[PDB]
Amino acid sequence: GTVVGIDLGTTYSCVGVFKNGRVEIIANDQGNRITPSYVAFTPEGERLIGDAAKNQLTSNPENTVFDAKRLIGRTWNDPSVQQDIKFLPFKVVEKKTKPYIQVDIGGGQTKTFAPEEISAMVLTKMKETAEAYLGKKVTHAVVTVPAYFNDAQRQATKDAGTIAGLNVMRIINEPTAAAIAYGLDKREGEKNILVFDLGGGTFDVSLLTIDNGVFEVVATNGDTHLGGEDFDQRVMEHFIKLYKKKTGKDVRKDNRAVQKLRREVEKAKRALSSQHQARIEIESFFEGEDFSETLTRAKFEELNMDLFRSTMKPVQKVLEDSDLKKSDIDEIVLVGGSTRIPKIQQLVKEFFNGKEPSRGINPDEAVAYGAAVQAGVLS
Amino acid sequence: KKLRVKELKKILDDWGEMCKGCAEKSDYIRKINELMPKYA
Ligand code: NA
């Protein structure tokens, strides 16, 4: 007997299997326990879902679909949608007051999708990731959504699951799933929980209460355009400038080199959470010299400090809107790989007067872990 | 809404119903509204 929990993230998704009374987070074809929520299409109309799509973004900048979760379940003239379409490089068009994503696949072929249909493809990839590992079909799922999602967005997410061939047993809230993964459902009494979720592209803060082991979302805030990718892009810019100074060449003219640089920067960011120095290489088709420079933790911190500091403002705001002081917070839950960054851990701890965040689960996997726990309960 | 969670669990337990995978207070309240008579 096997059921699944899926974190369907804005930038990254994750699948856990509940089997024999425990959760196993599953690695994809590339050995990665998170999969980008990215979709592209081959000229023959085949679906490229996850790493393959993300990894060709710079060469296919207008026909690589990502961030569909920003649009899912929303109306066209929603001010959120109208702001987000300014930043999305692929075509988003209106049909009957709803947003649709349009891509050119080649040879006079255009495909048009509701956000639900794109998210269904991402869910299918996660389903198939679990199935490839286990060597059997998986069907019954819990899928998570942001705590602020309304009934239409919850329905849209369920519909994406249904399209993907899943039996969506329940849609549950991301911060609640994370709280469950970290074991907060065992807490007794009345406690206040701050969930600090810094994803690849978004930042969500949720204030949850627990009362006799049962959660309630009291308030939510955040910054919809602050994420781990912003830290990567500032470092990429730093290295693009350094490359220009060393070689005289604009590395942006080499699209694959920029993509390779993004990987090196992501790897360096991960390394700098445990080490104090990391090497970043730039390989290019148009330059003989393989560029190679070190990035220190201190420089990584300097490049991003204002963004790191900006994460505290939504935390202040959620406390105000829940009539709570920082001293009323009993538990702190960190979600997202970016929360491994020591300076972020430092700032959160200092904000809460030295209070320790919960430990025990990879913060990129906590939401899928909790979803899988709940899938276990519900089956 | 104003009732504590132990009280909501008690209501369901008094009606001989369990809240399977009810992670949130609203899950308890949803199931109670499905069992409770309102039109006496
Ligand atoms: Na994400």
Residue numbers in the entry:
A (entry chain A): 28 to 406
B (entry chain B): 130 to 169
List passages from the publication reporting this PDB structure:
The ER-localized Hsp70 chaperone BiP plays an important role in protein-folding homeostasis. Like Hsp70s in other compartments, BiP does so by the reversible binding and release of unfolded client proteins, a tightly regulated process that depends on the concentration of active BiP and on the nucleotide bound to it. MANF’s SAP domain engages BiP in the ADP-bound state and disfavors nucleotide exchange, thus acting as an NEI to modulate BiP’s activity. Our studies suggest that MANF contributes to protein-folding homeostasis in the ER by antagonizing nucleotide exchange on BiP, thus stabilizing certain BiP–client interactions.
To better understand the details of the interaction between MANF and BiP, we co-crystallized BiP’s NBD in complex with the isolated SAP domain or with MANF. MANFE153 hydrogen bonds with BiPN200 and BiPT203, and MANFK138 bonds with BiPN239, contacts observed in both the NBD–SAP and the NBD–MANF structures. MANFR133 undergoes different interactions in the two structures, forming interchain bonds with BiPE217 and BiPD238 in the NBD–SAP crystal, and intrachain bonds with MANFD119 and MANFE136 in the BiP–MANF complex. Charge complementarity between surface residues appears to play an important role in stabilizing the NBD–MANF complex. By contrast, superposition of a structure of the related bacterial DnaK in the ADP-bound state, in which the NBD and SBD are undocked, suggests that the SAP domain could engage the NBD of a client-bound Hsp70. A binding signal was registered on MANF and SAP probes when BiP was in an ADP-containing solution, but not by ATP-bound BiP. Nucleotide release from Hsp70 chaperones can be measured by following the quenching of fluorescence, as bound MABA-ADP is released into the aqueous environment in the presence of excess non-fluorescent nucleotide (to prevent re-binding). Both the presence of MANF or the isolated SAP domain inhibited ADP release.
